[PDB]
Amino acid sequence: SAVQQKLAALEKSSGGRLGVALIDTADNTQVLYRGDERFPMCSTSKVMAAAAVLKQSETQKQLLNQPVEIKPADLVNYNPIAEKHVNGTMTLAELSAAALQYSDNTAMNKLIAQLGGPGGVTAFARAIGDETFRLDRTASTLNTAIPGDPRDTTTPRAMAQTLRQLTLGHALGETQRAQLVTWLKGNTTGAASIRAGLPTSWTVGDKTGSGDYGTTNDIAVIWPQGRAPLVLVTYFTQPQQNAESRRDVLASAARIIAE
Numbered sequence: 423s424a425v426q427q428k429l430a431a432l433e434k435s436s437g438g439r440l441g442v443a444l445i446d447t448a449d450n451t452q453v454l455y456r457g458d459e460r461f462p463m464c465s466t467s468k469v470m471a472a473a474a475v476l477k478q479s480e481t482q483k484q485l486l487n488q489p490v491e492i493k494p495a496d497l498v499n500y501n502p503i504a505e506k507h508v509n510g511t512m513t514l515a516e517l518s519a520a521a522l523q524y525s526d527n528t529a530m531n532k533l534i535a536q537l538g539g540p541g542g543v544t545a546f547a548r549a550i551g552d553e554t555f556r557l558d559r560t561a562s563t564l565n566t567a568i569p570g571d572p573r574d575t576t577t578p579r580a581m582a583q584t585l586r587q588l589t590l591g592h593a594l595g596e597t598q599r600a601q602l603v604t605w606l607k608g609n610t611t612g613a614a615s616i617r618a619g620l621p622t623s624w625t626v627g628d629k630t631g632s633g634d635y636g637t638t639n640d641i642a643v644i645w646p647q648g649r650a651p652l653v654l655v656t657y658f659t660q661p662q663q664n665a666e667s668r669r670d671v672l673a674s675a676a677r678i679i680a681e
């Protein structure tokens with residue numbers, strides 16, 4: 423289609439590898455660009471961990487208010503919220519918000535621990551029908567996004583279908599889905615990504631990711647006015663390990679999608 427020709431040109435101009443999946447819930451039409459290729463997830467996996475903890479809270483009613491100790495050994499590479507509560511506690515709600523809205527990696531590790539390890543996150547994905555997602559590692563002081571490594575990857579097609587089920591579908595209970603949507607809409611890290619390519623009258627919830635090999639990711643649920651919502655996944659990674667971030671590529675992909 424015309425959109426795929428433009429995304430291919432964007433990718434060629436960028437020097438990297440671009441992956442896009444759009445789902446239009448109006449008639450379930452899809453637009454894919456490398457939609458079945460693997461990409462390193464980076465911080466975009468946090469949505470699946472936060473969703474898995476929300477799912478547990480459907481039976482453990484008070485779970486989100488449970489206090490969790492933050493210890494100095496808990497701190498990893500990037501912890502802007504958790505470092506403010508070392509030798510104190512945060513609730514699972516506050517950790518979920520920190521992971522999703524400030525991409526706090528210590529907060530993500532507490533979600534992972536609550537789920538019994540990364541296999542608990544992957545398990546929740548399999549349970550809601552995502553056969554592609556795999557979370558293999560916790561966040562650590564040294565993380566990787568190495569070309570060809572299957573660890574901690576998914577495909578754009580898979581993550582878009584998953585993000586739709588979690589946010590617009592009913593993979594979660596009604597209060598849980600609304601909490602996740604609120605969390606995503608309140609993200610602070612995405613202004614330069616997918617949001618930057620979209621008409622400002624559209625409502626967006628998103629979660630970003632960034633890593634080495636200049637990996638630059640964003641996954642978003644999009645509410646245009648007077649129109650069925652969309653879900654858009656944009657993954658981007660580069661051949662050089664020390665490559666710079668390219669949030670502009672994600673903004674440009676989203677602008678191409680929005681036509």
Ligand SMILES: C=C1CS[C@H]([C@@H](C=O)NC(=O)/C(=N\OC(C)(C)C(=O)O)c2csc(N)n2)N=C1C(=O)O
Nearest residue numbers: 464465499500525565566567611630631632633634
């Ligand atoms: C700007 C950041 C870094 S921390 C956090 C995380 C998730 O993507 N990224 C990393 O932990 C990370 N590097 O972070 C910095 C850049 C702070 C770093 O430690 O060098 C990384 C490398 S490989 C991999 N997988 N994740 N998420 C974001 C985001 O864009 O939302």
